[PDB]
Design an enzyme around this catalytic site. Structure first.
Site, PDB file in Angstrom:
ATOM      1  N   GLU A  13    -104.023   2.242  11.497  1.00  0.00           N
ATOM      2  CA  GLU A  13    -104.978   2.896  12.385  1.00  0.00           C
ATOM      3  C   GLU A  13    -106.285   3.211  11.670  1.00  0.00           C
ATOM      4  O   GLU A  13    -107.348   3.176  12.292  1.00  0.00           O
ATOM      5  CB  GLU A  13    -104.372   4.170  12.970  1.00  0.00           C
ATOM      6  CG  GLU A  13    -103.262   3.915  13.975  1.00  0.00           C
ATOM      7  CD  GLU A  13    -102.643   5.197  14.496  1.00  0.00           C
ATOM      8  OE1 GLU A  13    -102.339   6.090  13.676  1.00  0.00           O
ATOM      9  OE2 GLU A  13    -102.458   5.311  15.726  1.00  0.00           O
ATOM     10  N   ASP A  23     -94.955   1.987  14.246  1.00  0.00           N
ATOM     11  CA  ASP A  23     -95.917   1.615  15.278  1.00  0.00           C
ATOM     12  C   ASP A  23     -95.321   1.632  16.678  1.00  0.00           C
ATOM     13  O   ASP A  23     -96.033   1.330  17.641  1.00  0.00           O
ATOM     14  CB  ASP A  23     -96.484   0.221  14.995  1.00  0.00           C
ATOM     15  CG  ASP A  23     -97.341   0.182  13.750  1.00  0.00           C
ATOM     16  OD1 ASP A  23     -98.134   1.123  13.545  1.00  0.00           O
ATOM     17  OD2 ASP A  23     -97.228  -0.791  12.978  1.00  0.00           O
ATOM     18  N   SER A  76     -94.391  -0.096  22.382  1.00  0.00           N
ATOM     19  CA  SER A  76     -95.005  -0.779  21.247  1.00  0.00           C
ATOM     20  C   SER A  76     -96.497  -0.480  21.290  1.00  0.00           C
ATOM     21  O   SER A  76     -97.213  -0.996  22.154  1.00  0.00           O
ATOM     22  CB  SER A  76     -94.739  -2.281  21.294  1.00  0.00           C
ATOM     23  OG  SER A  76     -95.543  -2.967  20.353  1.00  0.00           O
ATOM     24  N   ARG A  77     -96.968   0.347  20.355  1.00  0.00           N
ATOM     25  CA  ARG A  77     -98.346   0.819  20.424  1.00  0.00           C
ATOM     26  C   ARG A  77     -99.340  -0.284  20.086  1.00  0.00           C
ATOM     27  O   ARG A  77    -100.446  -0.304  20.639  1.00  0.00           O
ATOM     28  CB  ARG A  77     -98.525   2.028  19.504  1.00  0.00           C
ATOM     29  CG  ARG A  77     -97.617   3.192  19.882  1.00  0.00           C
ATOM     30  CD  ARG A  77     -97.484   4.222  18.775  1.00  0.00           C
ATOM     31  NE  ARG A  77     -98.651   5.091  18.683  1.00  0.00           N
ATOM     32  CZ  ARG A  77     -99.666   4.916  17.847  1.00  0.00           C
ATOM     33  NH1 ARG A  77     -99.698   3.906  16.996  1.00  0.00           N
ATOM     34  NH2 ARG A  77    -100.677   5.778  17.864  1.00  0.00           N
ATOM     35  N   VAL A  78     -98.980  -1.202  19.188  1.00  0.00           N
ATOM     36  CA  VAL A  78     -99.770  -2.423  19.031  1.00  0.00           C
ATOM     37  C   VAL A  78     -99.716  -3.239  20.317  1.00  0.00           C
ATOM     38  O   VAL A  78    -100.742  -3.695  20.834  1.00  0.00           O
ATOM     39  CB  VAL A  78     -99.271  -3.234  17.823  1.00  0.00           C
ATOM     40  CG1 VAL A  78     -99.876  -4.627  17.831  1.00  0.00           C
ATOM     41  CG2 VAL A  78     -99.604  -2.515  16.529  1.00  0.00           C
TER      42      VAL A  78
END
Ligand SMILES: Nc1ncnc2c1ncn2[C@@H]1O[C@H](COP(=O)(O)OP(=O)(O)OP(=O)(O)O)[C@@H](O)[C@H]1O
Ligand SMILES: Nc1ncnc2c1ncn2[C@@H]1O[C@H](COP(=O)(O)OP(=O)(O)O)[C@@H](O)[C@H]1O
Ligand SMILES: [Mg+2]
Lengths: 468, 480, 53, 466
Positions: free
Chosen positions: A186, B320, B345-347
């Site tokens: 990030e 993630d 899934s943040r990606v």
């Protein structure tokens, strides 16, 4: 110079023995040269026998007993000034962007006292962000602490970059962004998106200096990186007289790193496992963030709430210091309203008639009342249709929808990703616009003429173009 | 050299060893090894890799001079090794390209690149709704015996499609880490992989249940050091930690027997710095740094489903995203039992295959609506037509996402199925035979519309004309 | 007429029941948080006492 | 090699060896006392020629300076066919009063788990004759089976019925280990096994008994499991037999490990368990494995404190087992004995490649039906069955019939019931549950499925009621 020798290596904790009367004071930085560069130990205790116990800012693996240690003579010293802008800095103040050294004239200790009571400002006052919803319903404190709530998919990063842009343009103050114990991925995404947005500009002038201590850093570095960023900001305050921004993502991990460090030093853990020094450990960071005679440092702090428990000692201690809260919500984003700030969860101590003035307070209170009444009507409006309520209810529902759409704003940073020109709306025009809307002067305008516009002048222009 | 002062609990205190480095290996006269975790002013606290019966007071200790490290290189492919890289499959010595330390700094802020390539999990649910990208670190979290290892093993098995090819940029080498598992389970895993010819590209680092605590502690780090060879040399790797709860338990054992200060749930204070140090080594490297990557799938076991526990909280924070498996769904027959609401899934979409992204975009919406409306099924006597149709569609979508173990589907085999499900062609099919539909439909395509499957595989996108042809084929099949 | 009245009354009764259930959920969520913190603190005190001898 | 006692604190005895050659850890030391020899096991070397040891017998009466003899190796127990039909305590001495054990060999109780290359994989299903087990959680020969359950749910009766069904039929020798359980139940087991001819006081017999019942010190309750395990290992590795190693109670091994750890002064772990819990359990368990020389099947009863399966002891045990038979208090309070939880019980072998697609399909459909019924119970508790759809009503009724059909009258239970015990074949179980699932017996009242054998008994009892 003064040199001791390592005598004990236990995890991230290192004991160092010095000859008589040569002892470094607590919080002093000691340097050990290794193949991976300097390893910095921060003095934490005096154990007697001319021995000191210290916290390692980098991995102790590979240290040998008898490894000689050089005392720097002061706390961890980091570069300051405009030479830090656009640079990425680690806790010990070294560049990690591989653009070469940070050629600042000055270096400042990261440990320093808060301003004395006589130097504090006697009056609270507003820092206008140029964002309509924030400046109206959750005005930011000049030199205060603002807690930012949200996550992925709610525009948090572009909102932060818009704050960085708007404060720089309106007030001329630079910004410092600190990544306390958050993902390296990030941080890379933030750096890339900032270069795309233009708040970082390697070929020319840039608006923000970046400090990162990632999750992979030892507990001590994650603890002290927040003070490193704060120290960069305090220079722009004291020596350049600016109204600086200090972003801290995430403050919960400042607290958590403090807990880990306290555990490593053998201190008895306090309630629910946190450090016994929790309150004063937080205070030493927070009370440096304040307005003074020359300028101010306003802090925007992304705050995590473990187990969604607002009574947990970490968020409980953090909220004591916050002057305002900005609650980014995915629900508002699904309405298509950006920056997606929740108009009703976002709250500010300063939204008080004595601070903002009676006109601003009246307008903001009526906007809150309108949105709240509409929220209470929403289900029956869906069930029975908007026409089934009374004439006054139908009027207030229409006005509430128009106000809600009007709270959207196109950001100058998001212009890169959307093409829509950005708008920076100052507070007087915001109050005037929402006042005029509440008085029905523009009730005949269609709803989407209020969508993604600046002040009421843009409302008139867009309504004209939609009528043509 | 040094002289043992005391022995117990798998810890040996040694006088001398003045020049020893922290975490260096030492060899006892009996041949058992240890590593110097504690350096103290007058003694060294070694943790033993073998049973402490092999060490007794007064014994002489030899310094090795080497910080804990492991052999690395492609010569490990198809081999089973312990935490220190010694072969345990009983075959020949490990040929190695080099030797690398167990613990090394993760790649910094600058060298990384945003995840932009898919890890082809052959599971319809994971691939469609919670996709994984190369360089992503995706948690597999769930309760006892919920199919976690099944999901990771299907992900490993699916790579058989590309690892036979010539393009090293697509090939994905797999490392599987068994921590605290009984040796019989690892042997059956090896036999399962050899049965599908999956060992020729896999590596198994095993620190089984009886192996001393330090080896269970090191196994994830050393296996990550194996994967980092592929990462740094421009190749793509996948590492499965099975599982990190038992590594945390082993580290707690080490810390408590060394009498380091406890913390919450008696874990050492810095247990977060264990899994953050381990997992942040997963990265996608930029073109300057070699373009390589290392994907991580840490497994986590939650007692009673409690995700608020200390270690689950730490790992959920570090990763993630998560693939969340729920036993309630497993019993209902929804297997691999992925709870779609909790799995994120943040990606996310950036890693997904474009052709699958096109069709699966609305699958999420329909399943969310179905999750909201599910409570109405017990009140079917009066359903709003919207709720009735929502239930009818969501039931068939959920039934379609069921998948047998060790049966990964190619992307061009998933796309037609999800297209048919989303576009409602299944509504006319009785639920009990949806399972008959899928296997039939594919067998129809691969005999009547193989051009479409080949084009989807080659191009990876559904062009408008190709999409219309897919619609026509779907209706041509559903008619019979 | 009685049927229409009964259906409307049952609707309103279940609305009241849902309000009350939400209030109870808030109360016991607060209680759960308190008990969670207390359990963590007490077990940690036990561990510290075992360690400090 | 001899030393002197220097400190006695509870079960922990410190010894000092002037001769400067200390016994290696886990060595056995012996102290002569009026009560015979007291056996100590070395647990630590403290430095300055001092070793700290755990007593295997009561330490009251010990005196400082009392001389101790080093045996030169770990606790050594007799092995081989001479031990069959005889009762042995942890230290390896007979306690059946039938004189010395005549074994040619005595072997250490501490030994290495088989290396990875020695592991052998088997999928041979073990038929138990119990409907719920044979259907939803079939046992594996050469694997580990866990009987999880709290107090009074039925672990003892269940394991006695398992001994009846299996140990009589299984050709290979068996070993039963009473790790720290109730002496009353151990004596009952001994009497039953003499009655049924598994033990014989004349001629051949085919079960060896080891008992470390719970009145003994913590160390004995810890090491008795290894004492039994060593005899099982001798039958495996040195005779090539297929072996059954019945163990109750594994929770006692864990608890005694916790007690000894606390006494030794190790920092207690979560809820007081020892730091070494996971590795102690691993060292015990994965010695019990099927090597290429022979298979050691093991049935393990696990007490679950406070019925909490999340407690670190059951939680650690679960990871080692091929088939779990989780007894449930809730199922028992419905009166559905043997009260196995049909959903929490799980088996590695319930795979269509192992048991065939028909058996797998029946088991899966039973699980789906029971889970749907459990989900609907939450609503039925408020609105009853009247509000449910006809499909839901039908599935709930079939679920109730199936749930009661899983009950079975054990022979051992003829003191708890008057019903003659019966044993149901796996094939008949699959056929019966398939028939019930298909609705061929929708016309049968629920009570006809209670405590009956196969579906034939369902028909007979339905007619008898009518
Ligand atoms: N998709 C599936 N279809 C059918 N059975 C499945 C599926 N996935 C898993 N199973 C079965 O579920 C059981 C547990 O699977 P698995 O070993 O992968 O679980 P796990 O969560 O890794 O367990 P543990 O906690 O024991 O390590 C096994 O019987 C496996 O066959
Ligand atoms: N087949 C059966 N029929 C009736 N009751 C049974 C059966 N099996 C076990 N039980 C019940 O189990 C109880 C005793 O269980 P037991 O095994 O002694 O408890 P534990 O779980 O402590 O071993 C008795 O009250 C008995 O009613
Ligand atoms: Mg598993």
């Amino acid at each position: 110079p003064i040199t001791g020798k390592v005598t004990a290596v236990i995890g991230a904790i290192v004991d160092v023995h010095f000859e008589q009367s040569e002892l470094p004071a607590i919080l002093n930085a000691l340097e050990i040269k290794t193949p991976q560069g300097k390893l910095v130990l921060e003095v934490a205790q005096h154990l007697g026998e001319n021995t000191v116990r210290t916290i390692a800012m980098d991995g102790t693996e590979g240290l040998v007993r008898g490894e000689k240690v050089l005392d720097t003579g002061g706390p961890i010293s980091v570069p300051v000034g405009r030479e830090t802008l656009g640079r990425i800095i680690n806790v010990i103040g070294e560049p990690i962007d591989e653009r070469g050294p940070i050629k600042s004239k000055l270096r400042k200790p990261i440990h320093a006292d808060p301003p004395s009571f006589a130097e504090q400002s006697t009056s609270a006052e507003i820092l206008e962000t140029g964002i309509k919803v924030v400046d109206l319903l959750a005005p930011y404190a000049r030199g205060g602490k603002i807690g930012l709530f949200g996550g992925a998919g709610v525009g948090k990063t572009v909102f932060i970059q818009e704050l960085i842009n708007n404060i720089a343009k309106a007030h001329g103050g630079f910004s410092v962004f600190t990544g306390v114990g958050e993902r390296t991925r990030e941080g890379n995404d933030l750096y890339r998106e900032m270069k795309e947005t233009g708040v970082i500009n390697l070929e020319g002038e840039s608006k923000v200096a970046l400090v990162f201590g990632q999750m992979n850093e030892p507990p001590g570095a994650r603890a002290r990186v927040a003070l490193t960023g704060l120290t960069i900001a305090e220079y722009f305050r004291d020596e350049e007289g600016q109204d600086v921004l200090l972003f801290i993502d995430n403050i919960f991990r400042f607290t958590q790193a403090g807990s880990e460090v306290s555990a490593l030093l053998g201190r008895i853990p306090s309630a629910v496992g946190y450090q016994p020094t929790l309150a004063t450990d937080m205070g030493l960071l927070q009370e440096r963030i304040t307005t003074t005679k020359k300028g101010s440092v306003t802090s925007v702090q992304a705050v995590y709430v473990p187990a969604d428990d607002l009574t947990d000692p970490a968020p409980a201690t953090t909220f004591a210091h916050l002057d305002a809260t900005t609650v980014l919500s995915r629900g508002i984003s699904e309405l298509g309203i950006y920056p997606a700030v929740d108009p009703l969860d976002s709250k500010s101590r300063l939204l008080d008639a004595a601070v903002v003035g009676q006109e601003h307070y009246d307008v903001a209170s009526k906007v809150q009342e309108t949105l709240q009444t509409y929220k209470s009507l929403q289900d029956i409006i869906a069930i029975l249709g908007m026409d089934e309520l009374s004439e006054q209810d139908k009027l207030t529902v229409e006005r509430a929808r128009k106000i809600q759409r009007f709270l959207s704003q196109p950001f100058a940073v998001a212009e890169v990703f959307t093409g829509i020109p950005g708008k920076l709306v100052r507070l007087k025009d915001t109050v005037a616009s929402f006042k005029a809307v509440l008085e029905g002067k523009y009730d005949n305008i269609p709803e989407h003429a209020f969508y993604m516009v600046g002040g009421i002048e843009d409302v008139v222009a867009k309504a004209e173009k939609l009528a043509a | 050299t040094g002289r043992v002062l005391a022995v117990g609990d798998g810890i040996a205190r040694v006088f001398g060893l003045n020049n020893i480095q922290a975490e260096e290996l030492v060899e006892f006269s009996s041949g058992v090894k240890g590593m110097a975790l504690n350096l103290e002013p007058g003694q060294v606290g070694i943790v033993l890799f073998g049973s402490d019966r092999l060490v007794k007071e007064g014994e002489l200790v030899k310094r090795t001079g080497n910080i804990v490290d492991v052999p690395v290189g492609p010569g490990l492919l198809g081999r089973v090794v312990d935490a220190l890289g010694n072969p345990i499959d009983g075959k020949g010595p490990i040929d190695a390209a080099g030797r690398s330390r167990a613990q090394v700094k993760a790649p910094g802020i600058l060298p990384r690149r945003s995840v932009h390539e898919p890890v082809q999990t052959g599971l319809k649910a994971v691939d469609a709704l919670v996709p994984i990208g190369r360089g992503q670190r995706e948690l597999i979290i769930g309760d006892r015996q919920t199919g976690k290892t099944a999901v990771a093993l299907d992900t490993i098995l699916n790579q058989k499609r590309w690892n036979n090819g010539s393009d090293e940029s697509k090939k994905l080498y797999c490392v599987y880490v068994a921590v605290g598992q009984k040796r019989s389970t690892v042997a059956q895993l090896v036999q399962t992989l050899e049965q599908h010819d999956a060992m020729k590209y896999s590596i198994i680092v095993a620190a089984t249940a009886s192996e001393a605590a330090p080896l269970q502690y090191l196994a994830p780090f050393t296996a990550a050091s194996i994967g980092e060879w592929f990462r740094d040399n421009g190749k793509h790797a996948l590492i499965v930690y099975d599982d990190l709860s038992k590594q945390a338990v082993a580290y707690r054992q080490l810390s408590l027997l060394l009498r380091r200060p406890p913390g919450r749930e008696a874990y050492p204070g810095d247990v977060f710095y264990l899994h953050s140090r381990l997992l942040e080594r997963a990265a996608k490297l930029s073109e300057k740094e070699g373009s390589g990557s290392l994907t991580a799938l840490p497994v986590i076991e939650t007692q009673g489903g409690d995700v608020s526990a200390y270690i689950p909280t730490n790992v959920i924070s570090i990763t993630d995203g998560q693939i969340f498996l729920e036993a309630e769904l497993f019993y209902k027959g929804i297997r691999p039992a992925i709870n779609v609401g909790l799995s994120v899934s943040r990606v996310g979409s950036a890693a997904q295959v474009k052709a699958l992204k096109q069709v699966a975009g609305s699958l999420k919406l329909f399943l969310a609506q179905y999750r909201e409306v599910a409570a109405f099924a017990q009140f079917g006597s009066d359903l709003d037509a919207s709720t009735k149709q929502t239930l009818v569609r969501g039931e068939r979508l959920t039934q379609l996402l069921k998948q047998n173990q060790y049966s990964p589907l190619a992307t061009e085999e998933q796309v037609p199925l999800i297209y048919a499900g989303v576009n409602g062609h299944l509504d006319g099919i009785e639920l009990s035979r949806i399972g008959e539909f899928e296997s039939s439909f594919l067998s129809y395509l691969k005999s009547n519309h193989n051009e479409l499957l080949t084009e989807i595989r080659e191009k990876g996108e559904l062009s408008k004309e190709l999409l219309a042809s897919l619609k026509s084929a779907t209706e041509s099949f559903v008619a019979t | 007429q009685g049927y229409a009245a009964e259906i409307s009354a049952r609707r309103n009764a279940m609305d009241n029941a849902s309000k009350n259930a939400g209030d109870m959920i808030n109360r016991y969520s607060i209680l759960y948080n308190r008990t969670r913190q207390a359990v963590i603190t007490n077990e940690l005190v036990d561990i510290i006492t075992g360690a400090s001898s």
